[PDB]
Design a protein around this ligand. Structure first.
Ligand SMILES: OC[C@H]1O[C@H](O)[C@H](O)[C@@H](O)[C@@H]1O
Length: 437
């Protein structure tokens, strides 16, 4: 291996770290902002504010199609400028209105990352290393979440606090300023799949010529030529944004693609992300909440590492099924228990689900998505599938908190039904991809 392939992956992964940090920055220092702003109406406003990121990420995943059409060059570059300017706005805080709009674009930006970065990795790494390098995207999403917790709880236990949580929202602007200037050493080249948009064939050759340092790249460029000629034809055919529902041959991929992306949220990951400091308040103290959460995100970040190597060994379908097994062992034993014995099962729920998610479904989705739909439909369908993920985030998180307050037994039971449904969905429909186009 030649680390120049990984070099371009890490440069795009700065945007994955800005996503993960934006997701949980406000979710940790939420209580601090309440002090200035105004429980009660704050609980309602805070839920509205949480939604703006999910509603914005839907619109981000939507736009990162019209945007990616101009290249993953501008697509990534633009996020770093945007996120630097959103971080400047989020940091200037006064009232809910300002921070709702600011955290709506922190969601629009986040959306772009979910489509743009996995596509960049998928479109520059070798067929055989595609999965592990795509796993990097999640490895920095998870790292972004944990960093936010360690940075925030650093102030935990004020005048030198009001000038700190402000400095926390501003942190991703410096990271974006790093990433933007870092894509001056890297972003003088765009992924070889740009052969279809621009006939810069010699430039396309010189991309793979540096990636693996092989001067004769007749193998992947003639493989890209066959994938580009399939696109060149479809444009003359005029295959619409849809045509998936119109053509049964294309419906089986768009529907299964959207279904798998949506089923990621029907696991209960973002219930533990957005309500880390809230869901544990039911019994556990404020001193305990901060510990069980800082350990959780550290575990979540650490568990993404084993996925790097086992995504090419087992594959994508083999890993997906194992994640659905571990989630049944995390949900069903806790579901019947609540119809010292259940206090132990609380820690089992805390980590068994986190452990099985970060190594299995978490990264696999964002890499399996850019491995499906081998033709022009690729970028197109990969944007709408990732949008369903952010649509489902609203569909899962919102009712989950309502149902946790009324009956937790029914909640863990419905999540175990989905844990059975997803396993048998992957086993019956989901393909296995280890190298293609
Ligand atoms: O690690 C947690 C994260 O995993 C994935 O990236 C999901 O898409 C995201 O919604 C979740 O917050």
């Amino acid at each position: 291996f030649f680390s120049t392939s990984f070099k371009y992956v890490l440069s795009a992964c700065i945007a994955s770290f800005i996503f993960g940090y934006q997701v949980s920055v406000l979710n940790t220092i939420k209580n601090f902002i309440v002090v200035e702003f105004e429980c009660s109406n704050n609980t309602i406003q805070s839920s509205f504010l949480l939604a703006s990121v999910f509603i914005g990420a839907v619109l981000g995943c939507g736009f990162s199609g019209y945007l990616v059409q101009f290249g993953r060059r501008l697509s990534l570059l633009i996020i770093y400028n945007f996120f630097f300017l959103v971080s400047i706005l989020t940091s200037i805080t006064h009232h809910f209105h300002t921070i709702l709009f600011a955290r709506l674009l922190s969601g629009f930006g986040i959306g772009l990352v979910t489509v743009s970065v996995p596509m960049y990795i998928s479109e520059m790494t070798h067929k055989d290393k595609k999965g592990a390098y795509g796993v990097m995207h999640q490895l920095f999403i998870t790292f972004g979440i944990f960093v936010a917790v360690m940075l925030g709880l650093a102030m935990g236990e004020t005048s030198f606090a009001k000038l700190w949580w402000r400095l926390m929202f501003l942190f991703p602007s410096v990271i974006s300023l790093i990433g933007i200037l870092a894509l001056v050493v890297f972003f003088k080249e765009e992924t070889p799949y740009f052969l279809f948009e621009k006939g810069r064939i010699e430039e396309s050759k010189n991309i793979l010529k540096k990636i693996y340092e092989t001067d004769n790249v007749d193998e992947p460029l003639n493989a890209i030529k066959e994938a580009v000629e399939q696109n060149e034809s479809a444009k003359k055919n005029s295959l619409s944004l849809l045509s998936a529902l119109k053509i049964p041959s294309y419906r089986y991929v768009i529907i299964l693609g959207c279904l798998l992306s949506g089923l990621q949220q029907f696991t209960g990951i973002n219930v533990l992300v957005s309500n880390s400091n809230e869901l544990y308040k039911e019994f556990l103290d404020s001193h305990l909440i901060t510990i069980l959460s800082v350990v959780m995100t550290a575990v979540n970040f650490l568990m993404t590492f084993p996925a790097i190597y086992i995504v090419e060994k087992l594959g994508r379908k083999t890993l997906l099924l194992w994640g659905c097994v571990g989630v049944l062992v995390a949900y069903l034993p806790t579901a019947i228990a609540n119809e010292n014995f259940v206090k132990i099962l609380s820690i089992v729920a805390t980590f068994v689900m986190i452990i099985s998610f970060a190594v299995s479904y978490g990264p696999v989705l964002w890499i399996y998505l850019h491995e499906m739909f081998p033709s022009e439909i690729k970028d197109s369908a990969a944007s709408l599938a990732s949008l369903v993920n952010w649509v489902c985030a609203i569909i899962v998180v919102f009712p989950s908190d309502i149902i946790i307050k009324k009956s937790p037994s029914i909640l863990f039971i419905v999540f175990s039904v989905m844990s059975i449904l997803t396993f048998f969905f992957i086993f019956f429909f989901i393909k296995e991809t280890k190298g293609g186009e």
